[PDB]
Amino acid sequence: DILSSIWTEGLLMCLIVSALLLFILIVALSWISNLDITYGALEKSTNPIKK
Amino acid sequence: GDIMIHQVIHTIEFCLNCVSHTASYLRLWALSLAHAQLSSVLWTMTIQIAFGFRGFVGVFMTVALFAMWFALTCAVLVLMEGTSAMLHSLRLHWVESMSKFFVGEGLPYEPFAFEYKDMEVA
Amino acid sequence: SNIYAPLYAPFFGFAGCAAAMVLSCLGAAIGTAKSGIGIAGIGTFKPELIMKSLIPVVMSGILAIYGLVVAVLIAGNLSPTEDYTLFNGFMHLSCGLCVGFACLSSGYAIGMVGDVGVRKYMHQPRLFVGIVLILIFSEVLGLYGMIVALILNTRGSE
Amino acid sequence: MTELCPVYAPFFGAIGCASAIIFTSLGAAYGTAKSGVGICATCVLRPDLLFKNIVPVIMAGIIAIYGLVVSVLVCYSLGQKQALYTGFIQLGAGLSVGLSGLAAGFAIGIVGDAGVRGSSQQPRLFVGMILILIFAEVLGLYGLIVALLLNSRATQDVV
Amino acid sequence: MTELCPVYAPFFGAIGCASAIIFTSLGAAYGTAKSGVGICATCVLRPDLLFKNIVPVIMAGIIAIYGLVVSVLVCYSLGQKQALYTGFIQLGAGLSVGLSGLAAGFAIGIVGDAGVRGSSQQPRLFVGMILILIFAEVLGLYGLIVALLLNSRATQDVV
Amino acid sequence: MTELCPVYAPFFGAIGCASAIIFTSLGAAYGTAKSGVGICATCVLRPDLLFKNIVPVIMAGIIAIYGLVVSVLVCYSLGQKQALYTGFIQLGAGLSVGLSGLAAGFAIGIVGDAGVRGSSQQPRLFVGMILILIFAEVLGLYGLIVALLLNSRATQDVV
Amino acid sequence: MTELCPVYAPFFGAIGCASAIIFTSLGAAYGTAKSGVGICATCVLRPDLLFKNIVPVIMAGIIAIYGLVVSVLVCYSLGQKQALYTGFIQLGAGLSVGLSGLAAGFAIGIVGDAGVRGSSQQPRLFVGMILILIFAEVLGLYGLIVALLLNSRATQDVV
Amino acid sequence: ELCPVYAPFFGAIGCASAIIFTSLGAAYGTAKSGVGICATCVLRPDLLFKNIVPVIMAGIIAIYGLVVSVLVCYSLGQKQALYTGFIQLGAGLSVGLSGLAAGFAIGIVGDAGVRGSSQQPRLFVGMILILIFAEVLGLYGLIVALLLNSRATQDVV
Amino acid sequence: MTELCPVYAPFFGAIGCASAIIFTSLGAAYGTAKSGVGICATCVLRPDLLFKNIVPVIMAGIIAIYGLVVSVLVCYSLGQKQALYTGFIQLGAGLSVGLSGLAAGFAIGIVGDAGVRGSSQQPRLFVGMILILIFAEVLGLYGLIVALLLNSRATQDVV
Amino acid sequence: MTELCPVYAPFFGAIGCASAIIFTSLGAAYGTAKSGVGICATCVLRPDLLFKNIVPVIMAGIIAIYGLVVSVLVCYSLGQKQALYTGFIQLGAGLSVGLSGLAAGFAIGIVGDAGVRGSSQQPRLFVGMILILIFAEVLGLYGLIVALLLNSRATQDVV
Amino acid sequence: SFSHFLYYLVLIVVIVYGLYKLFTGHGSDINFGKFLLRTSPYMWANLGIALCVGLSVVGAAWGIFITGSSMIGAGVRAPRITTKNLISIIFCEVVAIYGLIIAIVFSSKLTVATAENMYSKSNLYTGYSLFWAGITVGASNLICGIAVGITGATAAISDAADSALFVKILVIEIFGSILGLLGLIVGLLMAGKASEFQ
Amino acid sequence: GVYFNIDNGFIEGVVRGYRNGLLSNNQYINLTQCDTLEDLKLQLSSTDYGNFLSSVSSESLTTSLIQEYASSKLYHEFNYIRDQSSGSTRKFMDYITYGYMIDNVALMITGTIHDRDKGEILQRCHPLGWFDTLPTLSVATDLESLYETVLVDTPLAPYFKNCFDTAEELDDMNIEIIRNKLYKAYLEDFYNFVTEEIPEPAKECMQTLLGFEADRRSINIALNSLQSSDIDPDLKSDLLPNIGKLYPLATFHLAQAQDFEGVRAALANVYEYRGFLETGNLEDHFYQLEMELCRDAFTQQFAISTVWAWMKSKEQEVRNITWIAECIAQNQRERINNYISVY
Amino acid sequence: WCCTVLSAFGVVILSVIAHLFNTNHESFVGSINDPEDGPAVAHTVYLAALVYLVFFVFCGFQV
Question: What family name appears in the similarity comment (chains D, E, F, G, I, J)?
């Protein structure tokens, strides 16, 4: 009943859990790094009618 | 001291720059090998094929292959890598030599003189 | 234990039922969301057509009901004290993939068709019969996968 | 489970009978969505052409019919023991009909959108449109023939 | 079973039989979609050319005919307990013809779209456009002939 | 099966034989498609250049012929009990010819397209077209030479 | 097969022999394609420079010749019972010449394109274009050097 | 046991990559520099010779790749220890990817420098200095490759 | 290495502890950054609302509190010879609270930014804003209570 | 290689200690980059606040200080004859502190950039900057407490 | 696309590995069944619970901000919509309610097992049941929250125009929430047959 | 369009709320029967505009003041939305702004060919196409100096480098060639940007609507060039927008056309434009089609195209208000029903 | 004019390499991989030098 010695069942569980963890981490970083600041409300535009 | 900020950056810059130039001195080796084995391969694949079977057609074969070898040896080598090693030996004098004692820029001296420039076109 | 019924077959059966339910829900939600886009788009101008044009939302709900029926009629005949052939496990997996992907296809089709048809129903009213006809075609598309799912389970449990 | 007929043999057949209806449904859904977009966007201007432009939707649904037929036949051909050979053969049949129907559905959707645009443009265009659409349907028909032949070949000589 | 004839063998034959029509169908679908967009764009304006400019779709269907022929030949040559060699040679023929047909369909679709756009204005361009279509078609013909040669090598002198 | 002639050895040969027509078919198809786009986009104004500016299509066909020659040469060398060494050699030869032909087809497509668009206005661009397309198709010719040397080595002094 | 001469040893050698010609052909094709676009667009206005601006095309041909030489020399060294050491060396040489030639083709195609567009209005930039093309060519030349010296080192002192 | 048959694989891949990655880096550098030069020298032919410098001292990266490749392959062996192969692979990767980074930097810095020098010539020295500091990256990669391969046969058993 | 207590059992507990703070910190940082951008955009024109619009930042901080509490409780429930049961309960609690806190922080940030931009216009939107923010915070609270229940159950009948 | 302390235990310790500075440095670098972009954009018009709006960079550096201190405290307990348990614990500490610091760095960078752009136009906003930015910092702080607790749990009663 | 090329690379690598294992004659070595059997059922059960509650909350919060951003955007001109439209938030948070209920129910079926019991038939059944029920609930409520949030945003936009539009559009969100209710029912049903690990 | 609300949900909500403020047909009918301009202001105050115009006296009220104040409110709203936008949405609105920055820079090169006056041009330069360096661009006396002032440091760089040379625009007329070719390049660039960096359905409801913009530009070019034979067709081909339903097949015949009959033959070629120019004036039918496309842009919910639809709808709504105000002040009430309302 | 200096150096180079080949020198011949056959290759290189001298005469007659 011994599965591939290199990829033991414990190591398989470790790597599938780590793959799920890294997938969640990559999704979260894809969302966070997608943040952009609404520059317009911050910078002072010299538009005469904006002011 | 008030010039301590300049002194510390000068000191760290000097030590790291000395080790950097001493390392950069290895690309004289690098260019030497580049030239040596590049000439080796060019000769091996032009003149070591020129003789061929030494037949009547072999005469034309060696003529054409020596023509190609000379064209490459000039245009590729002495122009391209000749200028490359010229400019690299010049990089020596830009950075490694002058950064040690070239204190800074000075006013160029251009006296008011004629030069007979633009004989026909300008 | 008999070799034809390994211990990991419930994994395959429950993967089938899970895929069935989840992906039928996904297709139904895509359909109902895009249909809701269309409904809210036409509501501002011609609100009187909302009740008549609500059909795609009900159709997506019917799609979800198809998915639920398949999922429950898979999950009914699975227990830890009963024999469970790996054949039955793959039959339930095939059932789940069948219904899930088929209802996802039909849900996407209902979503797009309902969106465009409802948005263009504001312009002239005769489009409603064509919209409902195309929607019936798109939902019987998922009904085909539903029928395949039922026949697959009935063959597997036998 | 004999080495001709292993315990995991029915997995291939299950995946085949799935993928058949799956991929035919994908193709039918894409074709129906594209054609319905065209119909609902052009019948606003020419409402009298709707029951003529509806034909692409029917021909897209024919792909779903093809997948339904293949899946039903494979479901008949399944069995706990069966053969590994039957597994591969009906997997091939399912994948063949599914992908052929998916290609047919893509082609039907694109050409149906274009022809439904052009029908209100020119009434005579419809005969050429339906000819092109038949030529696209023959793709799904070819896939149906291949799947049927594979299913027939699957069982007759297994042990 | 035997090393030369393992039970895993018919996988390759079934996949070859499927792909030989799957990929030809994908190519024919792409060609028919592009050609149909071209037709429903042009023949709106000059409906008297919908007879003449239908042949790109015709040869796109011919590609699927190649796929059908090779697929049914493989299916007839299929069988349980076949030599593993037969499985690989059939899969090789199937992929060869299928992807050659896919490339041919890509070429036919693109060149047919361009040619029908051009011929909507200039009629004399039709002969050159059909000749380029013939080249794109003989691409798939090469695919068919190599598949047929592999099929011929598949049967005989094999244990 | 012995270690030098294992059962899975014909895998490499079959995949090589398939790819030797597949990849060259994609190359020839892309070249033909883009050349046809160019000629059908610019020949509508100048039909007189239709005969002259079709040469990229013929050269793509010649690339396809290269692939077919390699494919038939390898197909005449497969066998159930063939050496693994052969299998790898004709796989490498198939990849070499196919991908070299893919590159050549890409180059000829791009260059023939740009060339016909340019040469519509300027007649003497055609000689430059011919020269550069020869220098592009010698890519497929070089791939052909590599494939021929590999195939000729495959069957020699092999056990 | 012994420990140092496995049955799968010729894999690396054959795929090195191939990958050399594939990747060099890809680089040559990319360079030829971009150079051809440039030449056509630049000498449709100024056709007298056709014979001159063609040089990057021949330079890409020289890249192809580099790949051909590496492949033909590696092919002869290929052997049935060759040491796996020789297989790894041949694979390394093939990759080292092929990818280097692909990069050289990338660089020379971009430079040749842009330079021939520049030379349309200003003629003295030709010499600088030639020099930069030589500096791009020397990269493929370095790939040739490394591949040839590995190939020579492959066979000598082998079990 | 310390000498697997697959040990030369790592050395062969290191030798290959040492020229591969450096060739790609130098190729991108030369491509960007050349397009910049020929985009600027159309409006100013005479400064061509001075503006060529990005191409030369980007191709220095390919020179480094070649020299590492030769000094690694001349340590390849049929009976080389797994450790020799791994050290050769490490040196090859180091030089190749360091040269790739240097090629990226040199390419775009030289592009910016030639665009700037198209206007006024005093930017010449500054672009030289910046691209020196870019090429020193391939220099450090050469250093690492040299020391690794020097150790690669120190006390091999 | 007990059968019930494998040496790698502490993996799941340790990684659950790490993730319980990692994902909650990711969500809290997203919420705080988005809310801070919203505040900087809304009180640059009306800095009188600075004291009010800060609350979503505090809610993101409370999400971070949930993550910290779960992580420290897992720390206290973390050992060397603990069974796979305990390690997996710690993993499950960590993943549950981490995903819940990440989503809660995401919603808090986005709603807070949109809301403060609205409240720049409408003063009475702040009740709705706090209401929706509490509804979002209850999600992280739900994750916290789930992790609490698991961890409190993690020492029931351990070996 | 005892079961409790495998020879590959130091993988987890080394990777945890490495990541503890890697991810914290990535977060700090992103924070300093965005904040510095904001500073160079704002202080060009308002150089008076150059020394005042510098604090986002200050606590972005404090994030890297957290990374340094956690890595150093991990190094104090990293050894050869270490149990898989304690190696995994210090890996978990490394990941926790690194990813919490990375989140804090993202939040600090975005908040500080927005704050400097706003505070170029509103003195009253700087207090809101400080509050929001301390709230961003404290998340990485909580990650630091998590890592410290894991390290404190990584040394006692280990075999 | 570097990511897409990476996906194609990993796919071709796994296909090549499978082909190598099959060709060598050890194709049976890659046994998915053996992998399922030798994994502790606690892994499946606890991942099921964790992803159940986590994905339910993820869908809930996703829909919440989708509807909330639009609610605030439409509330700048029509302040009256917030109270009448918080029903959208309720229907979007009820999916998190479902996730919490199923998580706490599943926690009951999580017990210890003896050395022989660990991999028993009932133990494996329970582990896999909890896993797939958790996935079903989590994903079903994820897409439920997505649909409910989109519909609630549309309802906010419409209620910015008139209240009758909201009253008529609430049916769409009702069915969207019925999606998650169906997920609740089916997950609870497929997990009811599972007995605890004892 | 599920991801759309992560960054633009609030903006979409505010834009839809503004859309709920668009004048309905009943509002337009009420404004039509206004006796005088002051009564028009009084009845308009009942709408979302409210007391926007109460800052000026009744006797000082005029149609120009009506346009100025209503367009100022429009520009305030747009600037607010842009200031509260982020990322690709901000770039899209920036593109919109470039759409009028084209006109402002074209107006600014006028008065630089003949540097008679400045400052008053800046006052006349409407703020929707404003950029920060425009005041700096004002001081540049020489045309070339202004050219490099706009060739760099302005978003006008790609269009100017696309088809212009620093000495070329001296000969070219500002209206006939300079502004029209700049609109051309703007339309190809904007259509490309939409095809690259936009989500569905905002995709389609941008390509169709920008194609309509290109088509109206092409029709105006074709029907204005016939009166001036100095424009040779090849330049006209270089002037046509290269995008839209007309391209490829129709725009070539429009370029080669040399009379009204030829333009008619090449124009009724496509569907949407039979009888489009045969009856009435181009402007009214073009605005009606623009309103139809905008209405559709509002049928979509989760599409960033609602910003463009709101912009064009509100601009034509203020144009309708000004048309009614003129028909009342000029007492030309016989053609007051030329306003176009689709709400 | 280009052929002038090319042939100028070619005559000398061909003559010297021919002399080395005819002298049976280690650095050029003797090794197995070398062509050996010193007299034959030397005669061929003599002929190459002769034809380059012919090109010299032909090109220089234009001066």
Answer: Belongs to the V-ATPase proteolipid subunit family.
